[PDB]
């Protein structure tokens, strides 16, 4: 009388890597491009 094994509930897909600061950096460059393009006119 030993509770038999149980099937692994399932998989809950969840993926997180290095986006935060990589895209914040990406942004800081576009802003400066915009400023320069504005300045030229």
């Amino acid at each position: 009388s030993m509770a038999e094994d149980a099937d692994m509930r399932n998989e809950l897909e969840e993926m997180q890597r290095r986006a935060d600061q990589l895209a914040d950096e990406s942004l800081e460059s576009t802003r400066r491009m915009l400023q320069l393009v504005e300045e030229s006119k």
Binding site: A19, A23, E25, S26, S29, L36, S40
Partner: peptide
């Protein structure tokens, strides 16, 4: 995912070159 973020960095790679070109035109 690792591949997705590698691709995002690859996409960002061109932003610096474009910024340099625009600053060149501004100068």
């Amino acid at each position: 995912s690792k591949q997705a973020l590698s691709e995002i960095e690859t996409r960002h790679s061109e932003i610096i070159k474009l910024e340099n070109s625009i600053r060149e035109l501004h100068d």
